[PDB]
Amino acid sequence: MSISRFGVNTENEDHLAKELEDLNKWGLNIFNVAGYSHNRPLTCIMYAIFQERDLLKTFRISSDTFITYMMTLEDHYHSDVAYHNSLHAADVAQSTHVLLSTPALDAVFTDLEILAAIFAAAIHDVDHPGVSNQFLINTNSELALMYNDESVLENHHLAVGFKLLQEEHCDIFMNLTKKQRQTLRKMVIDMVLATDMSKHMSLLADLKTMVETKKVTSSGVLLLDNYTDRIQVLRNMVHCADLSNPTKSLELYRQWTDRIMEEFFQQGDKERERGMEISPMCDKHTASVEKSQVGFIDYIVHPLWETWADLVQPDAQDILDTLEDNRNWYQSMIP
């Protein structure tokens, strides 16, 4: 049955199953998953990932409760937002799922840490309005005041992600112990807050420290016996998943760029219509898409992935290669 198999009822079962053969691959096409799942990419991908990792059984989560929660979570992502909709969330969850399976990190993380990372990815952008934290701050949002202008949306995504668990038959963590729930909550909070782009540098600095003090075993697997080191790697992994668009196939990457640019232009028109000063990248009349992608990669995405590649060398070399190739392509497209 469709639901028991994919967590969603679809008229394209055979096609959805073919796409899902790439569940553990960096090359999975989430756009197609969406197209063969009646546009339920997040519910479908989260169900597939959990079945793949046997998380439902391990954590005594009924398929029904999980599907109910996932469908609700997905319903809370805006479909009228060009980039920060459920497709992006599904993509980050799937990317994180692949990153957790990096050979160099084999048997490094606990099952609870794995659960927390994938869950964090799924809820990391829930109810995103399509405008930045600065826009919320500049317009004196009640949300901004509430979180003292720090990680405004990130704190909101967390509040929503957790609150939905209180919905009818939505508590997927009902059977965890008080200790497991406390641990998971703290780790998820840590990983979602880590997606706050303004924290980029604090994260990368920690990651370099992890590379510098790197320790591997005979097999070649990294050594991270202490949570204090592991949570720094997990925060950076979800951050890398969040900034993984430029590392995917050019075809996927180009679609991601078109979407984020549309969202930027949306905010630009909002600011414009409110006599506000248009934010950088948000002016559709002066935006330089290609040059901006090159800057994005050179200053932010590459520095991060290069360090990540060093940490798990050589598992992420092809990802770095792809990033570099995509960078040069957009560079050649600058008029």
Ligand SMILES: O=C(O)c1ccc(-c2cc3cccnc3c(-c3cccc([N+](=O)[O-])c3)n2)cc1
């Ligand atoms: O405030 C946030 O939470 C936030 C802000 C920007 C992005 C983002 C995503 C991109 C995806 C694909 C290509 N580009 C993306 C960019 C981006 C695009 C053009 C330029 C830059 N940049 O940093 O200069 C970044 N930004 C995500 C999240």
Ligand SMILES: [Mg+2]
């Ligand atoms: Mg975000």
Ligand SMILES: [Mg+2]
């Ligand atoms: Mg909303």
Ligand SMILES: [Zn+2]
């Ligand atoms: Zn995100």
